[PDB]
Design an enzyme around this catalytic site. Sequence first.
Site, mmCIF file in Angstrom:
data_model
loop_
_atom_site.group_PDB
_atom_site.id
_atom_site.type_symbol
_atom_site.label_atom_id
_atom_site.label_comp_id
_atom_site.label_asym_id
_atom_site.label_seq_id
_atom_site.Cartn_x
_atom_site.Cartn_y
_atom_site.Cartn_z
ATOM 1 C CG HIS B 41 -0.554 7.755 2.598
ATOM 2 N ND1 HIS B 41 -0.001 8.227 3.773
ATOM 3 C CD2 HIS B 41 -0.055 6.506 2.411
ATOM 4 C CE1 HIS B 41 0.837 7.313 4.249
ATOM 5 N NE2 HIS B 41 0.832 6.270 3.431
ATOM 6 N N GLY B 143 -3.180 -1.930 -2.363
ATOM 7 C CA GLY B 143 -3.539 -1.301 -3.612
ATOM 8 C C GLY B 143 -4.950 -0.761 -3.695
ATOM 9 C CB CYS B 145 -5.021 3.334 -0.801
ATOM 10 S SG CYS B 145 -5.051 4.865 0.130
HETATM 11 C C1 LIG Z 1 -4.080 -4.753 3.189
HETATM 12 N N1 LIG Z 1 -4.854 -3.551 2.916
HETATM 13 C C2 LIG Z 1 -6.179 -3.366 3.010
HETATM 14 N N2 LIG Z 1 -6.507 -2.121 2.671
HETATM 15 C C3 LIG Z 1 -5.289 -1.567 2.402
HETATM 16 C C4 LIG Z 1 -5.202 -0.176 1.917
HETATM 17 N N3 LIG Z 1 -3.847 0.414 1.847
HETATM 18 C C5 LIG Z 1 -3.233 0.454 0.603
HETATM 19 O O1 LIG Z 1 -3.766 0.059 -0.417
HETATM 20 N N4 LIG Z 1 -1.981 1.046 0.586
HETATM 21 C C6 LIG Z 1 -1.304 1.545 1.665
HETATM 22 N N5 LIG Z 1 -0.168 2.151 1.588
HETATM 23 C C7 LIG Z 1 0.399 2.330 0.293
HETATM 24 C C8 LIG Z 1 1.515 1.603 -0.110
HETATM 25 C C9 LIG Z 1 2.041 1.791 -1.416
HETATM 26 C C10 LIG Z 1 3.117 1.265 -2.144
HETATM 27 N N6 LIG Z 1 3.072 1.846 -3.366
HETATM 28 C C11 LIG Z 1 3.992 1.610 -4.470
HETATM 29 N N7 LIG Z 1 2.064 2.739 -3.528
HETATM 30 C C12 LIG Z 1 1.424 2.706 -2.329
HETATM 31 C C13 LIG Z 1 0.310 3.472 -1.919
HETATM 32 C C14 LIG Z 1 -0.205 3.234 -0.667
HETATM 33 CL CL1 LIG Z 1 -1.625 4.184 -0.214
HETATM 34 N N8 LIG Z 1 -1.948 1.351 2.888
HETATM 35 C C15 LIG Z 1 -1.330 1.880 4.106
HETATM 36 C C16 LIG Z 1 -1.783 3.310 4.396
HETATM 37 C C17 LIG Z 1 -2.559 4.085 3.525
HETATM 38 C C18 LIG Z 1 -2.956 5.364 3.907
HETATM 39 F F1 LIG Z 1 -3.673 6.138 3.069
HETATM 40 C C19 LIG Z 1 -2.577 5.898 5.134
HETATM 41 F F2 LIG Z 1 -2.956 7.159 5.431
HETATM 42 C C20 LIG Z 1 -1.812 5.155 6.022
HETATM 43 C C21 LIG Z 1 -1.442 3.872 5.621
HETATM 44 F F3 LIG Z 1 -0.711 3.108 6.470
HETATM 45 C C22 LIG Z 1 -3.218 0.781 3.022
HETATM 46 O O2 LIG Z 1 -3.744 0.643 4.122
HETATM 47 N N9 LIG Z 1 -4.260 -2.392 2.474
#
Ligand SMILES: Cn1cnc(Cn2c(=O)nc(Nc3cc4cn(C)nc4cc3Cl)n(Cc3cc(F)c(F)cc3F)c2=O)n1
Lengths: 302, 302
Positions: B41, B143, B145
């Site tokens: 991702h 953050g 992930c």
């Molecule tokens: C509340 N919560 C609990 N666990 C998570 C994990 N998670 C995350 O940390 N980030 C995600 N999306 C990103 C946004 C970004 C914005 N920037 C600048 N960089 C980013 C990188 C990421 Cl990965 N997500 C959502 C998400 C991550 C995936 F790997 C996926 F396959 C589908 C998804 F919807 C997330 O759930 N957040």
Amino acid sequence: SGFRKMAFPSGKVEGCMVQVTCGTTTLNGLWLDDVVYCPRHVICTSEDMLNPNYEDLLIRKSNHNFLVQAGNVQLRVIGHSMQNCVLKLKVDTANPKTPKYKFVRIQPGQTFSVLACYNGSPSGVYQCAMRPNFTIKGSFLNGSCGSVGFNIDYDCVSFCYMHHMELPTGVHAGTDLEGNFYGPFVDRQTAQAAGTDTTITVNVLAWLYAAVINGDRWFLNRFTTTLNDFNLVAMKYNYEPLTQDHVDILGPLSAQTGIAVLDMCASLKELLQNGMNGRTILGSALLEDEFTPFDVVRQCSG
Amino acid sequence: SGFRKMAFPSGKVEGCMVQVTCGTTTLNGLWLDDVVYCPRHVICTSEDMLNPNYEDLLIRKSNHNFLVQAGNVQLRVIGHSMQNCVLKLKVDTANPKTPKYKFVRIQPGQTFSVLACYNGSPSGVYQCAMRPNFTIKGSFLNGSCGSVGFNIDYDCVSFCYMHHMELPTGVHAGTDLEGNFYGPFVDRQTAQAAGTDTTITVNVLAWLYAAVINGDRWFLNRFTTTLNDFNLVAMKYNYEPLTQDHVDILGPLSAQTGIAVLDMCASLKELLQNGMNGRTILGSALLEDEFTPFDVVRQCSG
Ligand SMILES: Cn1cnc(Cn2c(=O)nc(Nc3cc4cn(C)nc4cc3Cl)n(Cc3cc(F)c(F)cc3F)c2=O)n1
Ligand SMILES: Cn1cnc(Cn2c(=O)nc(Nc3cc4cn(C)nc4cc3Cl)n(Cc3cc(F)c(F)cc3F)c2=O)n1
Ligand code: NA
Ligand code: NA
């Protein structure tokens, strides 16, 4: 989202754990710079443990009666001294993995991480609170003497607990790293009693805020109370009295959720008088009191 | 004595965590030998996250579109490839802190430790189980992930989980380290639903044995039952059915306590039909199902 019993990452401490043996008595020590800190109980033989005279016992030892093992490497003891209930072994090698650290005594109600160790080897990490009666409800087997408790602030390890003994009720007692006991205990193998424990009220309120942040809202209500009416009920239920300091500490969580502390106190009063009736909060059917306001902020905001 | 949610010491993993950025998308990666593993991702921009075509997106990148940071040191990306839902970044430096490791897929009901990380920096460690519906009830913020789950067997780190996303119900989903999802999820930013969860029966029995070992005996009774009568009641309460494999796994704990498994099953049947009536077991007012038989042995015998 979610809420777990979360410990600090333990790597910085793992590199400081060693094994200390004096005769056939063996336990864990903490190696920082060129000193090894460990419970002075290590200088006891079997016969000595029940009623030791530590000043006598220490006079009869020499640097070579102490075997310190850092994994495979044996460390050379070049001096020893006693400070209250710890022993300080001067060794000829400074630990190259010494983190930035400080020795800090904590107060009842505060939490820390424990690295449980056996024969100098880290076995598991968990979070626990210092109880108001100065014991911890840990998880420790024979051989864990000398395991340490710590918090991390940025890059700095704050050591606050060195494990000494299990009391007959199955709870645990130990000292700060200057060797001063938490609570009215002494380092001899006799039965000692802890005083009656109480529930840590400010922590219970912090955990209710965590629940609201995670969407558990069923216990909220329209009422407010005053510190005084609250404390009169809390006392009845063996809860620590709440202070205006506690109220200010809960500040950030009131802000983030828009619920005033005395509003949340009114919910707590209801839960105490009526119970929970088979509902749960954050997956628990009891009121939790081992999470500090700072633990909640660290975990629910970052 | 005592019984806590105990995680494995995290130091061996902490040294493998890095930060990976592609454009403005940033998350955590795992640096072992000269490869960095991270959720694919990361190659999505904002516009791409909802319905990505990963093969297209990857074709359009070059090694220099990837910024890997190991604390202060930046690492030079020299090749990349995709394996199912992970990305493998070949870097020019092998991590000198690579532990002995293996990649292992776990089964529902098994437990592991999670090292929660943000911007490549370890923040906290906790223990959790893979649920029967292939989600975990973690604690994670934006953050996180790329944070990993692991067990330790002697000197060997077994990596079993890489965190990807939070589902709308606040539970978490991710892949093994070969990039294959646990459960019927896909790595896109859409609302996906987990199936209904069930209670992990063999773990509940393991935890009842832990209670007996720690002196909590009030729920025991003189009766026995058969697998079949038990399973007919368990099914009614949304409990996993018990197998003869489960019975043999509980062997060491039956030995140590002298209580036969089907004897303990009769206690569990009683607790399910009558509740606990304001009594607690190991400090809980609910039946716990996140401790495996092996977790109990590790913690109550060493
Ligand atoms: C509340 N919560 C609990 N666990 C998570 C994990 N998670 C995350 O940390 N980030 C995600 N999306 C990103 C946004 C970004 C914005 N920037 C600048 N960089 C980013 C990188 C990421 Cl990965 N997500 C959502 C998400 C991550 C995936 F790997 C996926 F396959 C589908 C998804 F919807 C997330 O759930 N957040
Ligand atoms: C069940 N449990 C939970 N926590 C503890 C901690 N603990 C421990 O690990 N060891 C102890 N006594 C020793 C015996 C030894 C036998 N050999 C060969 N070497 C030994 C070293 C020790 Cl330290 N104790 C008891 C104990 C330790 C003290 F430091 C103290 F001041 C008074 C005490 F009664 C112990 O509680 N066991
Ligand atoms: Na209210
Ligand atoms: Na029975």
